[PDB]
């Protein structure tokens, strides 16, 4: 996580909402154990669960800023 604790939208913890986060999203969503993920950063919509809603939020972030 960056300067907050966790950075929602930045799953690979690089400080930016990018297409690499999509990868990490999809890993955990598929049920993979993602080494080097910020597992808390996946809950982008802030519901407490890592779901496709967050994926859609991620797509929102990444489409806007950097893919």
Residue 15 beta carbon to Ca ion: minimum distance, rounded to whole angstroms = 7
C-alpha torsion 28→32→36→39, nearest 10: 30
Which CB sits closer to Ca ion, 53 or 60? 53
Interacting residues of 27 by C-beta distance below 8 A, sequence separation 6+:
34, 37
Residue 33 beta carbon to Ca ion: minimum distance, rounded to whole angstroms = 19
The three-state secondary structure class of 15 is coil
- 14 contacts Ca ion (rule: CB under 5 A): yes
Q: Which residues lie near Ca ion (CB under 5 A)?
A: 10, 12, 14, 18, 21, 43, 45, 47, 49, 51, 53-54
């Amino acid at each position: 996580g960056s300067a907050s604790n966790t950075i929602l939208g930045d799953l690979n913890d690089d400080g930016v909402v990018n297409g690499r986060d999509i990868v990490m999203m999809r890993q955990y969503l598929a049920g993979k154990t993602v080494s080097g993920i910020d597992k808390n950063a996946l809950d982008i919509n802030g519901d407490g669960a890592v779901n496709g809603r967050d994926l859609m939020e991620l797509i929102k972030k990444v489409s806007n800023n950097t893919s």
